[PDB]
């Protein structure tokens, strides 16, 4: 129990080290879950932002088409194609 | 003997190592999902920008058509 207590002690150090590393891991897991939440959130937001942008620009395109068409219509109501 | 308190200590070590291995695995998985998320934000930005570039190009083409008809209308009555 002198090179045998010396093994026991080492194993106690070992168990402690493992406890601390487990604590660390679980911490890191939580940190990552949170960062991930944040980036998924930002993805949803950016998507909404982009959708709205596209919809505006499409609205303008459509308006312009519509005017070109106004002209075409009042043009061939005069029989001209 | 009485020095078979050792056995139960390394039994404890084995339990802990396995708990740690699974945690580190879950952490690795989260790290990966996070990286995927960031890569994805970059991609979205690229594809949306491109979609918009195409849409704006069409809007503008149509604008030039209307300006061309404006010119054609002034060069009449």
- Measured in whole angstroms, the distance separating CA A50 from the mean position of its chain's CA atoms is 14
| Among chain A residues, CA nearest to B4 | A8
Nearest to A8 by CA among B1, B40, B34: B1
The number of distinct structural domains making up chain B is 1
Contact B37, A40 (CB under 8 A): yes
Resolution, Å (one decimal): 2.8
Q: Which domain holds residue B38?
A: 1-77
- How far does the CA of residue A60 sit from the closest CA of chain B (Å)? 7
Method of determination is: X-ray
Determine the Cα–Cα distance for residues A66 and B59; give it in Å rounded to an integer: 12
């Amino acid at each position: 129990e002198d090179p045998n207590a010396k093994v026991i002690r080492e194993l106690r150090e070992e168990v402690e080290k493992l406890r601390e590393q487990l604590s660390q891991a679980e911490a890191m897991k939580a940190e990552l879950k949170e960062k991930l939440e944040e980036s998924e959130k930002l993805i949803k937001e950016l998507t909404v932002t982009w959708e709205e942008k596209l919809r505006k620009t499409e609205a303008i395109a459509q308006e312009r088409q519509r005017q070109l068409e106004s002209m075409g219509i009042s043009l061939e109501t005069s029989g001209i194609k």
